[PDB]
Subunit: 170 residues, 12 copies
């Protein structure tokens, strides 16, 4: 069994090595893709020290979404941004990660990771309900609060859960 991790434009993408690692215990291949806006949060060579394949549509523009989707029994968005959730809910797919996801709702799990204002946005909530309606699994993200070093303020968030929790959810 193979899993594809879809990484979005969040700081929490920098922890993905710890999820590659736990997932390699129970899946044969753990592969990773990033959104265009996600590529700047990550180091492609570093992911390749853990995951089996890094799809990079900038290096290989002609990678096929159907073939990638078919190779995987599970596809997760972790961390999932508001933008990616709301694109997927409306069938928007102007990059490879979004297109893969659009081909495979039945294999798809989303791990919401965002600021509370974005999570509680009416459009986001409705779109999360469309997706649940359409067969996509959404992790029941807890609302946490925490000191953010970059701003020197407390921020309220829903965040990607711990790795072992991902393994149970999928």
């Amino acid at each position: 069994e193979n899993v594809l991790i879809c990484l979005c434009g969040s700081v929490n993408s920098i922890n993905i090595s710890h999820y590659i690692i736990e997932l390699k215990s129970k899946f044969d291949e753990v592969n990773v893709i990033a959104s265009t806006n996600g590529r700047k949060f990550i180091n492609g060579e570093i992911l390749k020290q853990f995951c089996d394949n890094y799809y990079d549509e900038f290096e290989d523009p002609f990678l096929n979404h159907v073939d990638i989707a078919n190779k995987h029994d599970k596809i997760i968005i972790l961390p999932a941004t508001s933008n990616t959730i709301n694109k997927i809910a409306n069938g928007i797919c102007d990059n490879l990660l979004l297109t893969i996801c659009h081909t495979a709702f039945e294999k798809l799990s989303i791990f919401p990771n965002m600021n509370l204002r974005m999570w509680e946005n009416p459009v986001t909530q409705n779109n999360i309900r469309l997706l649940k309606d359409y067969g996509v699994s959404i992790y029941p993200a807890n609302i946490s609060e925490s000191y953010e070093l970059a701003s020197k303020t407390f921020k309220k968030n829903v965040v990607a859960p711990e790795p072992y929790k991902v393994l149970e959810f999928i």
Copy 2:
């Protein structure tokens, strides 16, 4: 009378020269524009051996969508990707092609071309329904299953129809 062909990111865009040839039998100008993602499937210099105008937003970023729309009696999306359909259904126009289409629903004909999984995605079907409600012509593309050389598998697709059927539909 003038027609505009809008090419999306699909391998079926490399057959566009055949449709241009046949549309020149009915139309004064056959002009062409590609989506950003569709640019990599085609060769704009080859396109200009057959079309009258190739609109290229990268070469000329101040191209005007209203002026382009107004100059055409018919605008077609061939091949029409899932992405482009779902974007057009939601009013998203973040490239020139999409902006042109937004301006001219009453002139707009779409030829879906995509994997069956994407065609059957509930969101895409919802969006197809909406486009029809807003008066966009949608070609009744047939579902075919052929052997794909690129993956060495059989795939099920809705596909752009032969050129003479495009002529009859618009």
Copy 3:
């Protein structure tokens, strides 16, 4: 009290300096961000002659939307393209401007600027309704008609109102 001006890809963005000047009569900081397609319409150094901060994610990709959002009491979109309205109505936030506006519906005022046909597009009109229902404040622009030098034709538009009208509305 601080105000953020979000400009979209419209020729009316070249008049933003007058809006900045007039807005500085009433707010401490007048700041500015452009859409990605917006950038080509404005001159960033010229904007910095009048505004206090010009937020540029191509220059600084890790600018944080929530910190910029919280910094401001009012966020206006002017001129507001159909694209940006339709993305925001759908929760789509794939550049920084969009991500800011997504986080702050309750502070948002939109000044539509687009051709009649885009304005009358039923999706645009549905989404404008939707935004108002979710607490976004939308200027009641009227269709005007003027001679457009670029096309040597009369064009019908909704346009950004004069600065005094902006001050009044927000």
Copy 4:
């Protein structure tokens, strides 16, 4: 009946839109050239939304000064920098705008635009009188003092007059 606007390196170049629009009510073509130093204050693609030709030395280095001069009945420098005035007074033509003007004193109208200390420089003052002695019309611009937002101080300048005053003068 043709007019050329020559723009120099002043922030008042950003309002050339309004002058072009006004001049278009009285002249067949309204064309534009910028000095090398003025290019950075404007956006050529925006300029071309309003003027008939934007002459760009860097795009087309072999543009001819006599042919361009001959094409126009009236050539104006608005806003005219102290540099460009003093170069023209001394016959210095190391760019296309200055070379055009050197060829066309009989057709030339100058609208000074500068800080008062530059306007009051005896060298500038001497060059103005020379330019008048040799048949160049210099707008009798008056000193004005306003708050400059960029420096947060009041500044005295002589400024280009509003559009209608330009039509009245030339």
Copy 5:
């Protein structure tokens, strides 16, 4: 049994995919290489959707002509330009495609494709005669007259024949 398609700098190169698909019904591998000049008429990633190997001298300058020749039972030049026909006749092999052909005359078939004036150049005639004498098989290309969209004129040509005839000739 493997075949190598050598494509030259002709617009008829854009139809190469139909010949590839046809040749895949008989041959195990169908591989492709283009002349230096032919590269601009084609898209290598699109070719790789249908062919097994696309040999690219620019990307892999050390590709070995002898190993490539030896891997293939048949080598065809389609479309064959006058230039390539004439360089092969004369032992000129200054690119990878021509070098390969030079090492494998006994495996070589040529499908002339060129304006009649070039086909009836006496030098080209003489060189077709000399290539047959060396046991290179030259398709007996028929002359045809057609309307050419790119010139808005009728051109006389010898043309690559339909794919089924290609299969039948080799």
Copy 6:
């Protein structure tokens, strides 16, 4: 009538403006193309001060040889290098200049310009003879001796004759 000047890689290419001026006395249009090696000897913008059209394959790789040949009543090579002469005689056409010349022997004049050693090379003479047989007109160039500044030696050459002799030859 129109004439095309093909310039090859020789320092006599720097005098071509005197040929254009003389040819303009007798030809509606005098156009110019250079060999790839000939480009480094000339200045394109300087040529376009004198000639009507300068065809530049690097700027426009899809210039059509047929369409260019057909526009011209007489095509000349002046100065014609040994390399170009020998290539035309063998039907090699790996640039645009040789391709055009390959399609119009009927209309082709050649003005040898080269050192004596190259002129008296037997392969050149054989090729000169073959071109004469197949309809091309070779100017009976004569052998001169001249002090050459670049080497500080007397060299023996065959050269392009004076401009008026070019007019009387064609």
Copy 7:
């Protein structure tokens, strides 16, 4: 008080750290700017080991001449080239250095540094004479002879005086 050192295109610019050091004994800030030509004679990160601000027009093209000028009690040109002296005498300000100086004659001291032939050029002497009449302070430069390594010859110059003479003169 603040002083601004303006350096021109001269090898004596390499000694400016010693003048900066000297001036820091009297002035609060010693800031530095180079002419465009001057820039190749110096190293701006090395200048910044000594001065407070290094104004760099190529890095920050919108630096304001009036605000820089106003910040400084004294502005000195050291070493002042014949070019800069003559441009200043004529009101030519085509770079930031010359513009600043143009706005601040009353604050300006010049330290002529140049070959004797350039000093005794009558135009330079005329311009020195006019600069004095306009109230610009000119160091009474003395004429030294010395062996110059670069040419291996004896050269006569007027040169910048020692640091202590500079402090004393301003």
Copy 8:
């Protein structure tokens, strides 16, 4: 004896080979420099085929004006643009050609080449008069009228005279 030819931004600069050859009959070294704006009119490598040294300030920025002037018994400006005439007369030297000329009035011969309007400009005439006063020789340029291919209009010019005429003047 050694002579330096200074070329300016004029199309007449493309015959300088003819002047170089002539001047070699009576001068041991014939060297050449272009103004920055004259570089686009000439080919430096073609120049080095005839001249002894081509002084290229872009490739060697530290070429020394005093040393270059000292090497030459005569410096000639041919063709001399109005800009370069007017800059010499005002002691401006922001390129190497201007600087070398500022250092050696007593060795300087100027051959004016320009449109009549520039020649009859009162500022240009002032400056010609001043240079004669200061010992520069100015060739008695005649006014000629001729048809200019580039514009397709008769132009009035003062022009650099025949080569032998230059030799008897310097």
Copy 9:
């Protein structure tokens, strides 16, 4: 006496340091040129540790073929490719190596180096006889069959002879 070694695109070019060392015992200068295609097989700086001049067309595109030919008493092509032998045989000189050889058949010695299939091409065999008829000496190279490491198979070639045999033949 001086000797020039012309290197072509063969892996045996890597051995040329041995040949230069050998030849330096008999000839004053031993100089080297590469074919355009051969440059990728060699290291110009390494060549320069051994040969006196390395002629590089790309670094020095105006290197003169006559001057270089004349400097040398013997010119050899080692290793000589089928391409270069066939071009020279037909007077084709589209690079500097081939142009030098074209000038000096009477000085020229060729050491073939190519796969047997190429050597046994009737075209090559023909061109070899022609070259001998024109007085070019062709080493009587033996056919040899070696294990080739790069392909893991045995190959039949004709091969450049050992250095000492090159001294004996030349």
Copy 10:
């Protein structure tokens, strides 16, 4: 109380955020530098989400080692490579990181992190002892064996310890 974390060319440099976070509890500023070879393992914008300052010699080559050392009460190397350990011990300091540590032995702690063959290289052990004798504090890292995804093999290492252990040791 500031602490500087120095980062070396190790895969454990990807866990550094976790150390930054823990250290910001006990220290006011936690700052970061990487070795030249550490840079490719790290994301400098991501680091700036957690650290106060990131010293980047490539962006700011003139950062002063003495000033950076003086600013910090503790400097730690973590992860510390063999290379960096062995350079520091011999006083080699050809990057900013090593020069900072060369200036500050009395503040320096080292957390070695490398394969066991490197740790047990006798030169590394000797160097570790010298550093101990020179006041540097070496974390007594334990040997651990573990499965490395990157190789698919078990590896023995000394590794950087958990963040809390780092706090306890410095």
Copy 11:
């Protein structure tokens, strides 16, 4: 059994092909890595004609030293620079080559190649002694005098022995 050859910055590196070929008589794979300064002495694609893998840090920065070391039974440095020897003795490993050797002293054999003066340097001799005590095998090279063409002088060196000698020693 596999062997790794580590090439350093020496002109004797251009003979490494003979070493690889002879080593392929006894080892399954013969692989190769160059030092950073050695890269400029060799031609990578040429090396891949003979070796099985050429390890290139610049093309693949994440290549792993432990994995490469473990793969090989013998690692040889040849030619071995003074620098590399002295770096290895000290534990310095700031490129991939050095890092490999650092990890595998027990498999390492060094073939010194340097000037007498570097070889006789006391540090170099202490370092050779140190490496022997640490298990490294050092070829007991002899000083030989050779005439060096590069300098036209006789030089004294220790050099890499012939391939058969390498086979014997390792």
Copy 12:
């Protein structure tokens, strides 16, 4: 007709090198210059060529030969000499042209140390200076001084390169 080569390292005192060149020209026929890799950013090679005879630039000519350069010079000096360069030399590390030149020519080599006192007093640096002396390299008995540093606005202690006349007397 002796020749001296000045080796410049990565320190702000390299900015003064035209003065030393001017003065060495009274004692030496050619005065030539090379910089370390990091040293290059402190200087302006074309400015150096106004004063020196040859500026050896490894970036512009990567095949310059350290043996031929060393043999052309009677005296080789490192001025200013960084701690890194001294410690690389002590250990035979020659990863650039300057360092390779010094490795080949210890018997000709004089070092004028220039660095913060902390680096001078680092025992590693002190051990290497002693070894360099053991192997016959001349080390200028550098002056320890405390001066106000504009760049940091603080007082720093340094060993510093000496005035040009002291260089002339030491070599």
